[PDB]
Design a binder for this molecule. Structure first.
Ligand SMILES: [K+]
Ligand SMILES: [K+]
Ligand SMILES: [Mg+2]
Ligand SMILES: [Mg+2]
Ligand SMILES: [Mg+2]
Ligand SMILES: [Mg+2]
Ligand SMILES: [Mg+2]
Ligand SMILES: [Mg+2]
Ligand SMILES: [Mg+2]
Ligand SMILES: [Mg+2]
Ligand SMILES: [Mg+2]
Ligand SMILES: [Mg+2]
Lengths: 740, 740
């Protein structure tokens, strides 16, 4: 059944909304350019601009180096996709029976091996463009946020948030436009074979998350080596302020906010967006929508994202035009309003899209059977994902903001030293998982029940339907974080650093919230892909109580720990070398501590550049080799176990790591600000409580910026990778069981 | 068909072997009594006796308090068991057709409800005896180990190890003999109805682990609050030795080792022994052994345990007589040789047992079907668990002993502060899970394939066939811990503490190893019980990709994190109180720091007692209520997911926590001993490195002694509980799906 909105309306609506989001982001970049500064007050403006240039050059330099390796890996792995998928029907040029309906004839499997390779490289390139653009705006707006901090918090907040929105709307409108364009290009070849079209398209998400795994790990290693080294020697050993220009690791630290927290994060979320859209597409592909070639209903996920951009645009105005921040206590509530407003507005949006872009009745593929589904049931699938996200944001704020007891109790535990600070921090993180898991389970139950794997996929997209806003609040953070580091390197007034610090602490909470959305959506989308994988691999039942599935389940559950071991050990080893370097400079360069001599920044940049590029590779290998190794040697049943186990296991450590690290940071920020008497009782900066907080903060650095947030990528990447290679695994895999 | 070993022989062999183990234990306790002391230098002998009595009194006191609460919970829960099980057939007294053979009449379900309650209480009481006896031997051997340290490590080693063996053989022979007696007593009633005989018997393990959960958590909180408090204030703050008699928290610290590391541990391992034997028995009971009433083969697991006692007796003689330690580097290898010899001897013993106690062919129940199994396949089932254990032992040694690079690098990482020490230690723990998980997976695959759930249960039992020795080397540790604690409190020479420190470091590794075995066997027995549950609940297929199962899976996987949040927070909070109290005495009691005034030990004992008796309740409730809540509300399918999820997810956190904490401890011991240039450069005691090590160690305290080791109980306890209540859930559960 056709919908109210005709195919031509949809063909127009989607890219119109994208260009709108692009226009809007370009516009926000313009308003941010209204803040003038050059390296030619005035003496302070010149210094800020010199510091920005140092950071901007350091950031661009690292991404270029990083993307070189990753681009090469991108090219190599694309050959593997062509070869393995092409080998399914021996590289035949002949058409064959449809995988989904043996009464019909489909395009040759080799064409699909080729179009998978193309969309993969599309996804890889879009992923790199995402993180790179985000870096460009972030390294542009940081000093602009510092300069506007001379006029109050509100003025600096806007600059930071407008700039976060630039990244938000650019990433979200570009990822949509490319997908839409790819789908229409692909359709030219595939014609009536939508099954093959969208099976090819799923390479897009595989491309996105592949180039994101390396950018999150590599970026995260770079940034945390510097962070730990700068803060330990600077603040704990030498009693100098954070981000002090004497500290040789400060440039690498602040560069690191852009190459990890911004660039890697942008790629990470692009992967999430792309996989969730593609997952929905691949199931609709072989449900009534794709079989009846109903284009509008087929592109329902892209229509939801389209409305999401408009909703997020109106939402953004509330924090950019309609309201101003007068007290620092208004920052976190302002950012949270963004989530609440977008969630409420988008519920209405999805209601409308569900009403105009869907027939009231259709069928959804359900493990070999066309299942009857109503459009109001699909509305609820998108909606549970959307609201689960908001719930996750709220619980995450509660456990990571210093406006509430959990983080204040952690700061408070500093009176008895670093050991109690850490025990309390760990326990907080563990505790934090409870509600998010419950929210995820409710989303799974509701959406699985109504619409099977498609429902779960659109629940994932629901949670990410507000991604422009989500990215905006998140990106706002590292921009504020740089703004404070620049203020201190520029030797500005203490009132400036206090303002940026308030903006920064809100960004800490905000970045934890972003991790929650990433982990929540990854859980949902991976589950949906898992289901699609099982179908595509022609498995009758994934029975937990079979030797093959169970070994996969327990081994898959171990993988997130293995991955965490590597990345933790890497940061630890790199930070250890950074500390030794910072100490060397302080102890051998005369006048450095005195303020007479310049530190050698480039040496610290090198330590974390060398460590990141080298050490990003094994965890990257572990994630990408696991589907291939298990699928080839052990078979699709065992890989099924690996996927379920790594999902339910990886999710727990991801959440606890991110929240623990976030809480330790904000506990530290609490002490540093001294905005209440309790906070003031743990101070001043330099006290034993403050230093204990800093210890916990630096332990949490790799937890929340390297291992923790990369875990969502590990889970969803393996899931999509498994689906893509399912025909190959089902045919040529299971080797060890065929031999013995 | 009958085995070579006739039923009457088996009836004799088993108790004879239990009596041999009990006689051996008594003999060792006798030889240990040859070390004389009394409280009535010669002052050194007197001071040791007074300190020992203060520790004995404290430990006997706490367990009485703890066991009183637990014994009351036990009685209540036993009523719950009777009521819920009896309600399945409305408490009818009428016999019904046997589920395993409709041509036969079985005893009423009501009788099984009664005998299940009886076996539950038996297991609970035996668990309590196990922990209490262990505490009584440990608190008898501690000061005798101190006095013998005057003659050297070798002498001290012998008394500590002889004593650990007292516990090991008493616990193994007692667990065995009680189970043998219960089976014969229940048989008087059940007659030919072996299915019901052994279904009732499974409450034994349920009682064993129910009580162990509280003994582990309660004792664990008690000891760790003291430990962290004593260590932080005394060592990091006040710069005094560890276990210094001036420190008010030292008595509670050392009582703690007996109350947690001994009594808790003893109950814990008893539950493992009981569940594995019971898991094997239920499956055999409705296989050919039970269907054909072949006693010898039915009691195969008990015969294996009978032989293990004898094997371990021999093995013990190698560390007790045939070899003398004369140098500190020989302690760990002696300890490791215990595992090696027992494993090799038991491989032979298990071969002999498999040859004389089984018919060459038989059938094992396999989800409704009788699976043809051969006796050499069964030999391999128990042998693969036996050998997986040793691998776990070797790998765990490699990660927790300061003789190897992992821990030495952790210690080395102290050179850059507490933050790096914590990052390295966490990474070490994560890294450590890999081989054990693979070892468990291999064991599952082999034993699952050959003999389904019975094979799996029998592999778990295999892993614990050498439990007398396993307990011996383990119990050796806390005894050695107290010995150095007593030596310091007694003001004995530096040389004595040096010998005890060498004994105690080996104990840290040995404690990690015991944890490895408990987690390994927990995974195995839980999976077997999971499978039995599924049949008992008449579940046709546990399909991962159904809404009901998957939500159980993701929620199940979260439970171990919820549990770790609670226990970590408890210790953190009680430790924070302990620190405040210790600081108060040092700061306000004139003459304390000077050693002319005595501290108030009792107040610290009271803080540990109050926190542990209170805060053991919620995590205990989380474990025991979960099957009931899920089974009653959501039904057996969902509970299935929960059983799988908590298994695969819980083992990862249990392994990484135990090993990280172990590594932090021995990294500290390495610095404290200065037995090489590298270790010395990190010292001396009181250096910034040492204090960084102490910070790591104290964070590790609750990880490895409260949360970590209790996790194996969480996993395995929910598994027996689900099986025991399975008929009740299958019939009266799943309400939320019945209402709607
Ligand atoms: K941040
Ligand atoms: K120990
Ligand atoms: Mg920092
Ligand atoms: Mg930063
Ligand atoms: Mg910063
Ligand atoms: Mg921060
Ligand atoms: Mg940081
Ligand atoms: Mg201690
Ligand atoms: Mg101790
Ligand atoms: Mg001790
Ligand atoms: Mg120890
Ligand atoms: Mg300790």
């Amino acid at each position: 059944g056709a919908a109210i909105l005709p195919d031509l309306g949809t063909e127009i609506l989607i890219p119109v909304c994208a260009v709108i989001g692009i226009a809007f982001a370009l516009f926000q970049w313009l308003l941010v350019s209204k803040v003038k500064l050059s390296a030619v007050d005035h003496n302070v403006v010149v210094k800020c601009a010199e510091i920005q240039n140092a950071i901007s050059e350091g950031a661009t330099s690292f991404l270029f180096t990083e993307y070189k390796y990753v681009g090469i890996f991108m090219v190599a792995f694309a050959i593997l996709i062509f070869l393995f998928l092409g080998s399914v029907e021996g590289f035949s040029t002949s058409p064959q029976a449809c995988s989904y309906d043996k009464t019909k004839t489909c395009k040759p499997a080799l064409a699909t091996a080729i179009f998978s390779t193309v969309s993969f490289l599309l996804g890889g390139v879009t992923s790199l463009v995402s993180g790179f653009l985000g870096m460009k705006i972030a390294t542009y707006a940081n000093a602009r946020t510092t300069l506007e901090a001379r006029k109050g918090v509100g003025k600096a907040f806007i600059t930071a948030f407008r700039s976060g929105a630039v990244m938000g709307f650019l990433l979200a409108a570009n990822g949509l436009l490319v997908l839409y364009i790819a789908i229409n290009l692909f359709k030219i070849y595939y014609g009536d074979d939508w099954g093959g079209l969208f099976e090819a398209i799923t390479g897009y998400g595989l491309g996105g998350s592949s180039m994101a795994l390396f950018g999150r790990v590599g970026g995260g290693i770079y940034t945390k080596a510097a962070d730990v080294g700068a803060d330990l020697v600077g603040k704990v050993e030498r009693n100098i302020p954070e981000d002090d220009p004497r500290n040789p690791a400060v440039i690498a630290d602040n560069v690191g906010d852009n190459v990890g927290d911004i660039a890697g994060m942008g790629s990470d979320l692009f992967g999430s967006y792309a996989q969730s859209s593609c997952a929905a597409l691949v199931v609709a592909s072989i449900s009534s929508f794709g079989l009846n070639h109903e284009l509008t209903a087929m592109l329902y996920p892209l229509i939801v994202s389209s409305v999401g951009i408009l909703v997020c645009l109106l939402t953004t105005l509330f924090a950019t035009d309609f309201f101003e921040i007068k007290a620092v206590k208004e920052i976190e509530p302002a950012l949270k309003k963004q989530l609440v407003i977008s969630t409420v507005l988008m519920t209405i949006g999805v209601a409308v899209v569900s009403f105009v872009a869907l027939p009231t009745s259709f069928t959804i593929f359900n493990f070999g059977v066309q299942k009857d589904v109503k459009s109001w049931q699909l509305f609820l699938c998108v909606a549970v994902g959307l609201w689960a996200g908001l719930i996750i944001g709220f619980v995450t704020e509660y456990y990571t903001s210093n406006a509430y007891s959990p983080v204040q109790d952690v700061a408070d535990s500093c009176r008895t030293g670093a050991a109690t600070n850490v025990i309390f921090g760990l326990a907080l993180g563990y505790k934090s998982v409870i509600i998010p898991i419950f929210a995820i389970a409710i989303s799974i139950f509701v959406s699985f029940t109504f619409a099977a794997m498609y429902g779960i996929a659109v629940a994932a997209l629901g949670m990410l339907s507000t991604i422009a806003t989500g990215l905006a609040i998140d990106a706002y953070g590292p921009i504020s974080d740089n703004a404070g580091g620049i203020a201190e390197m520029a030797g500005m007034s203490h009132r400036i650093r206090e303002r940026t610090d308030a903006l920064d602490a809100a960004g800490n909470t905000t970045a934890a919230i972003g991790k929650g959305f990433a982990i929540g959506s990854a859980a949902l989308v991976s589950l949906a892909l898992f289901g699609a994988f099982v179908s595509r691999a022609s498995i009758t039942t994934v029975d937990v109580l079979t030797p093959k599935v169970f070994i996969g389940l327990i081994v898959g559950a171990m993988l997130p720990y293995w991955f965490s071991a590597m990345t933790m050990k890497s940061v630890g080893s790199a930070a250890l070398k950074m500390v030794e370097e910072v100490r060397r400079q302080f102890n051998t360069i005369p006048g450095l501590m005195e303020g007479t001599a310049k530190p050698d920044y480039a040496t610290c940049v090198k330590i974390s550049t060398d460590a990141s590029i080298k050490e990003m590779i094994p965890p990257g290998a572990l994630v990408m080799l696991t589907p291939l190794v298990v699928g080839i040697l052990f078979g699709v049943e065992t890989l099924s176990g690996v996927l379920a186990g790594s999902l339910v296991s990886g999710v727990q450590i991801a959440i606890s790591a991110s929240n623990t690290g976030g809480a330790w940071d904000n506990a530290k920020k609490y002490i540093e600000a001294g905005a209440s008497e309790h906070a003031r009782s743990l101070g001043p900066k330099g006290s034993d409580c403050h230093k204990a907080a800093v210890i916990g903060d630096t332990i949490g650095d790799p937890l929340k910026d390297t291992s923790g947030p990369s875990l969502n990528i590990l889970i969803k990447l393996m899931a999509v990778e498994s689906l893509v290679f399912a025909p190959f695994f089902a045919t040529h895999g299971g080797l060890l069981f065929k031999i013995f």
